[PDB]
Amino acid sequence: GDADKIMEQAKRQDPNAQVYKVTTPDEIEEAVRRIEKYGAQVVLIIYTSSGIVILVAVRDPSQADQILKEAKKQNPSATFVRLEGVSPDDLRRQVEDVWRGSLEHHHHHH
């Protein structure tokens, strides 16, 4: 399905990129914990269907930009969030707010 396509769109461009798919907040704390080492460079959060969150990470920003450009053009509603200025442990709050937003709808404006 669409989740399996989107995770492979990262691997087809850079097979070294770490990608994981989670359906729960208890799975997110595992995904962020293994990404914390790798995503210390660059991270992307992807939000597909009614609550599935896919977490992707890379060691170069060009790989994230290229993968995102293909993934947007193939999947326009998949909602991409690029991470660089937030710490790899603080990334939890950004991923978890995207998990919660699927169940508990809020505007979350600046």
Side-chain angles (χ1 to χ4, degrees):
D2 298 274
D4 310 277
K5 167 176 179 76
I6 244 161
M7 67 177 68
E8 282 178 38
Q9 283 203 250
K11 303 190 71 177
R12 83 90 143 137
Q13 210 288 111
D14 178 27
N16 306 281
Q18 299 202 130
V19 67
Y20 306 113
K21 178 272 218 171
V22 303
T23 63
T24 100
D26 287 276
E27 290 190 324
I28 284 162
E29 63 172 78
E30 185 58 44
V32 294
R33 174 177 180 87
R34 58 185 63 204
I35 290 170
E36 157 172 89
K37 305 298 184 179
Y38 212 80
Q41 270 71 91
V42 176
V43 174
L44 259 159
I45 311 171
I46 307 93
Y47 170 49
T48 186
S49 194
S50 300
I52 301 99
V53 182
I54 307 173
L55 227 190
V56 78
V58 272
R59 305 197 77 182
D60 285 280
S62 187
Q63 279 44 48
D65 187 78
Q66 286 290 354
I67 288 163
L68 175 148
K69 281 188 70 175
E70 307 292 73
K72 245 295 183 181
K73 282 173 64 180
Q74 291 288 288
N75 327 267
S77 56
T79 307
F80 301 92
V81 192
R82 238 183 289 201
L83 271 304
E84 295 185 81
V86 193
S87 281
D89 187 62
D90 270 281
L91 166 72
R92 290 191 290 98
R93 310 311 294 130
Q94 300 288 97
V95 171
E96 291 173 292
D97 187 73
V98 168
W99 197 84
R100 295 297 300 192
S102 76
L103 312 189
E104 182 174 30
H105 302 329
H106 181 235
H107 307 116
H108 202 178
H109 286 22
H110 307 316

